[PDB]
Design a protein around this ligand. Structure first.
Ligand code: NI
Ligand code: NI
Ligand code: NI
Ligand code: NI
Lengths: 11, 275, 99
């Protein structure tokens, strides 16, 4: 299953 | 075995034609198992392997919402990148993301991955330590400093050590008939006269999984590397793969040539001849 | 970055005249992802052609499989035609049942 946001924020 | 799970995201801007198109696909090993496409009629994560189908509605619903949020986030990332590099607002650009986990036979995490490319060049990547970043240039260092200040690595690390590994192990168990047991190639050698003095011997490997394979021709037991045409391994369209290797030989000397096939699904390496 | 696509055209199963099969055109190693791929029967575009979901390799280059159900015959000629920014003319690769 994929990772969620938050964490993994905008570049 | 050693196994991996990976997600591959691609966002492509098209200024003037609306928001960037976002596509994601997920793989376990060489098997694609899910997809999402933001240009679909009503975008949703969809199954692409039989063993994922047993996941309940909450699974698909949560992943669908995740992808829709990711498409928005990539759109903002693409706007930021355009600014970092001082690029015109008219052009199309590409943001690709790939992340996931490798585990060993005991199910323990061997390596985590989380990295990005802009316009097909490496941009930033989480290092093997899952705690620090490698940035390609001064633009990517802007992203790096932002992520360092916001403790991004720790949240990426939490996913890669926890949910990634736990869900991969689940998929391996649920799909074990398809994922844990290699399918050996079906093999044959064909012969094609070119002229009265030259013919092509082609060694075929069909229907094998996973994609890793080695095909080599030998002449009297010695490798013919410099003289073999080898095609790139290619998908059959049914989750299995194909490859062939060919050599041109003098007519009447075919019997000196053997094709050797190595693949995880074979009990032992094969030796094939024209027969 | 621009990278020129590799192209292979081939059948899912060994060809047998009069037996239903799949015709595949695999395009790979390309960038950017915008690409046009048509399967042709006797030079004409085949209409019901599907394709795999856009994916990429560890070097970030893209790959796609385009495919259609077909029944090979002695006479019918099949090919794949690809247009991409790296190609100054369309690349046409003929299907050869021995490849
Ligand atoms: Ni295993
Ligand atoms: Ni034979
Ligand atoms: Ni350029
Ligand atoms: Ni399409």
């Amino acid at each position: 299953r994929p990772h969620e946001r938050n964490g993994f924020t905008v570049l | 075995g050693s196994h991996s799970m990976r997600y591959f995201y691609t966002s492509v801007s098209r200024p003037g034609r609306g928001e960037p198109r976002f596509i994601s696909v997920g793989y376990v090993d060489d098997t694609q198992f899910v997809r999402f496409d933001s240009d679909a009629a009503s975008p949703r994560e969809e199954p692409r392997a039989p063993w994922i189908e047993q996941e309940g509605p909450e699974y698909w619903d949560r992943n669908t919402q995740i992808y829709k949020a990711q498409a928005q986030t990539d759109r903002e990332s693409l706007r930021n990148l355009r600014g970092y590099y001082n690029q015109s607002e008219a052009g199309s650009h590409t943001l690709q993301s790939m992340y996931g986990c490798d585990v060993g036979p005991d199910g323990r995490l061997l390596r985590g991955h989380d990295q990005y490319a802009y316009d097909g060049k490496d941009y930033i990547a989480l290092n093997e330590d899952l705690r620090s970043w490698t940035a390609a240039d001064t633009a990517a260092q802007i992203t790096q400093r932002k992520w360092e200040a916001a403790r991004e690595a720790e949240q990426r690390r939490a996913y890669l050590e926890g949910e990634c590994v736990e869900w991969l192990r689940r998929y391996l168990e649920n799909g074990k008939d398809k994922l844990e047991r290699a399918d050996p190639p079906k093999t044959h050698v064909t012969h094609h006269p070119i002229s009265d003095h030259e013919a092509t011997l082609r060694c075929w490997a069909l229907g094998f999984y996973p994609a890793e394979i080695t095909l080599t021709w030998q002449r009297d037991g010695e490798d013919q590397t410099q003289d073999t045409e080898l095609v790139e391994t290619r998908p059959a369209g049914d989750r299995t793969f194909q490859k062939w290797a060919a050599v041109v030989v003098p007519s009447g000397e075919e019997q000196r040539y053997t094709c050797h096939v190595q693949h995880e699904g074979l009990p032992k390496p094969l030796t094939l001849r024209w027969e | 970055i621009q990278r020129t696509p590799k192209i292979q055209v081939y059948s899912r199963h060994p060809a047998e005249n009069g037996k239903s099969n799949f015709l595949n055109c695999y395009v790979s190693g390309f960038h950017p992802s915008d690409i046009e791929v048509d399967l042709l029967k006797n030079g004409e575009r085949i209409e019901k052609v599907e394709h795999s979901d856009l994916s990429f390799s560890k070097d970030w280059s893209f790959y796609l499989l385009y495919y259609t159900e077909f029944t090979p015959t002695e006479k019918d000629e099949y090919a794949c035609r690809v247009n991409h920014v790296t190609l100054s003319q369309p690349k046409i690769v003929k299907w050869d049942r021995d490849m």
